Amino acid sequence: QVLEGLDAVRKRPGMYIGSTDGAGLHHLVWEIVDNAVDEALSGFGDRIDVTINKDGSLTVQDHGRGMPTGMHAMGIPTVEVIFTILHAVGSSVVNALSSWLEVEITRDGAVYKQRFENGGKPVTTLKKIGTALKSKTGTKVTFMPDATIFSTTDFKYNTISERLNESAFLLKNVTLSLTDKRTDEAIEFHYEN
Numbered sequence: 001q002v003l004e005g006l007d008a009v010r011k012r013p014g015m016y017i018g019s020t021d022g023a024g025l026h027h028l029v030w031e032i033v034d035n036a037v038d039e040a041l042s043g044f045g046d047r048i049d050v051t052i053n054k055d056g057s058l059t060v061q062d063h064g065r066g067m068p069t070g071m072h073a074m075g076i077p078t079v080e081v082i083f084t085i086l087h088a089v090g091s092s093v094v095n096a097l098s099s100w101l102e103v104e105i106t107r108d109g110a111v112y113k114q115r116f117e118n119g120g121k122p123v124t125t126l127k128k129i130g131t132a133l134k135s136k137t138g139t140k141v142t143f144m145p146d147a148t149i150f151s152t153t154d155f156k157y158n159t160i161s162e163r164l165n166e167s168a169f170l171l172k173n174v175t176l177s178l179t180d181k182r183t184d185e186a187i188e189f190h191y192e193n
Ligand SMILES: C=CCNC(=O)Nc1nc2cc(-c3cccnc3)c(=O)n(CCC(C)C)c2s1
Pocket: 032, 033, 035, 036, 037, 039, 060, 061, 062, 064, 065, 066, 067, 068, 082, 091, 139, 140, 141
């Protein structure tokens, strides 16, 4: 397996997300959402909240275990490795195609954050920013799609709502929410089995 950096994604985005139109833009949402859904399917977390922010960015929040907060080689956080090496995989592809991205992790009584800019270059390490109850766990990913790559950077509420509805139906017993801060629209989906 040949590992690559984020420049490879930026030079051939269609190879990773199919296209650079609205379909590709929304693939970025699906990758992040799917990672939160995988975590819930494994039994960690019973709600997944998606927000379309007024500035054009998009946030996904889960209440799963929290991405690992430790280090890989050479003092590099595991989360930085997840977000910056392409195993050619969604997290690194979204980072590559974002003008900025923030990941916030909560676990073990601590809240940590790392910020990337300009196609996924870290501008901070994984920094402890605060504290939380020892019981509190999860991951939050916010990203701004790169307007230099996509033909449209307008997330579509109806498109996202349909996909989260479907994902709630497949998962069971997990609430998926969508809030649009541009229009104030909001919806929740939950299917009990
Ligand atoms: C909110 C937006 C998106 N949501 C997520 O990405 N949520 C996640 N939760 C976890 C929990 C654990 C994990 C496993 C084993 C033990 N403790 C934590 C973990 O390894 N991951 C990395 C999996 C791959 C992305 C490397 C994640 S990714």
